[PDB]
């Protein structure tokens, strides 16, 4: 439910970033997604330990589902953060927080 709340918060941030020239709001939102996906990782970890306390176990349908969800959330959040960040200066004049 913590990760669901993070997903919700990232959703409102992303939706609000598209209006009134609020491009900057795309920066925090990605993190939420990342963190949400990140939580899912440790979430399945807990399931793993349950599997390690109770014979043969198999992962068939929803394990790949959760793994793909976590991978998509993490990678998309990182890519969104990198894209929203302006640039590496690469020039002596160029720097972060410049005039557009």
């Amino acid at each position: 439910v913590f990760s669901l709340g993070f997903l919700i918060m990232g959703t409102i941030c992303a939706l609000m970033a598209f209006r009134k020239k609020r491009d900057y709001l795309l920066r925090p939102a990605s993190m939420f997604y990342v963190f949400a996906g990140l939580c899912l990782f440790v979430s399945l970890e807990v399931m793993r330990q349950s599997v390690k306390r109770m014979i043969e176990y198999y992962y068939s349908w929803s394990f790949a589902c959760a793994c793909a969800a976590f991978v998509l959330l993490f990678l998309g959040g990182i890519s969104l953060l990198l894209f929203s960040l302006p640039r590496m200066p690469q020039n002596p004049w160029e720097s972060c927080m410049d005039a557009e």
Binding site: S3, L4, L7, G10, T11, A14, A17, F18, D23, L26, Y33, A36, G37, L40, S43, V46, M47, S50, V51, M54, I55, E56, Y57, Y58, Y59, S60, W61, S62, F63, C65, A66, A68, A69, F70, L72, L73, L75, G76, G77, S79, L80, F83, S84
Partner: protein, 49 residues
């Protein structure tokens, strides 16, 4: 409008959307682990087994 109207951020946002949808489906789908001690088909989930 460079990092908003660009397609490379819109495809990323679509990936985020499909990811959140698939994560929500994963929570409901409590069928990611079958335990057979070896008639006892067991499904494991985070909310309800």
């Amino acid at each position: 409008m460079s990092p908003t109207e660009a397609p490379k951020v819109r495809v990323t946002l679509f990936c985020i959307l499909v990811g959140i949808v698939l994560a929500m489906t994963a929570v409901v789908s409590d069928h990611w682990a079958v335990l057979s001690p070896h008639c006892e088909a067991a499904h494991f989930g985070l909310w309800r087994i």
